């Protein structure tokens, strides 16, 4: 071996392989933005658990009602509807939360 060799690569079937670094997005942060095609104030997050990536977005529109988008759920169910699915049905609970 050459002493100048720094190392850090694999040997697969007699060939030398190196793994590059992917510049992904933050794994759990919340990012807000705004598009001009509507007045939507979209805030989207990526959620990671055991290698599974899920995209969740909550936003408003011209109606002024908050809507939520969930994977495998095509329709944007309203915000209060999805909040009451998790409990805390009383109207005080939502505002307190």
Partner 1 sequence: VTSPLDREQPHFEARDLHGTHWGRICPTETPEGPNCGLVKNLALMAQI
Partner 2 sequence: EHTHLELMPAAILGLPASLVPYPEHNAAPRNTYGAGMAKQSLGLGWANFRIRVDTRGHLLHYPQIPLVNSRIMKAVGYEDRPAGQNFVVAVLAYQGY
Q: Is 5 in the site for partner 2 (CB under 8 A)?
A: yes
Select the residue interacting with partner 1 from 11, 22, 86, 97 (CB under 8 A). Answer: 22
According to DSSP, the residues that pair with 67 across neighbouring strands are: 59, 78
Closer Cβ to partner 1, 12 or 20, answer by number:
20
Select the residue interacting with partner 1 from 13, 21, 28, 72 (CB under 8 A). Answer: 21
Nearest to 91 by CA among 79, 75, 73: 79
Going from the C-alpha of 89 to that of each of 9, 59, 68, 69, 77, the distances in angstroms are 56, 21, 17, 20, 16
Q: Which does 4 bind (CB under 5 to 8 A by kind): partner 2, partner 1, none?
A: partner 2
């Amino acid at each position: 071996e050459d002493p100048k060799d720094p190392g850090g690569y694999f040997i697969i079937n007699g060939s030398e392989r190196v793994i590059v670094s992917i510049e992904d997005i933050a794994p759990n942060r919340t990012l807000v933005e705004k598009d001009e095609r509507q007045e939507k104030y979209i805030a989207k997050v990526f959620s990671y658990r055991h290698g599974y990536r899920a995209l969740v977005a909550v936003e408003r529109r011209k109606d002024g009602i908050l809507y939520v988008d969930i994977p495998n759920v095509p329709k944007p169910v309203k915000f209060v509807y999805v909040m009451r699915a998790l409990g805390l049905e009383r109207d005080k609970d939502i505002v307190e939360a």
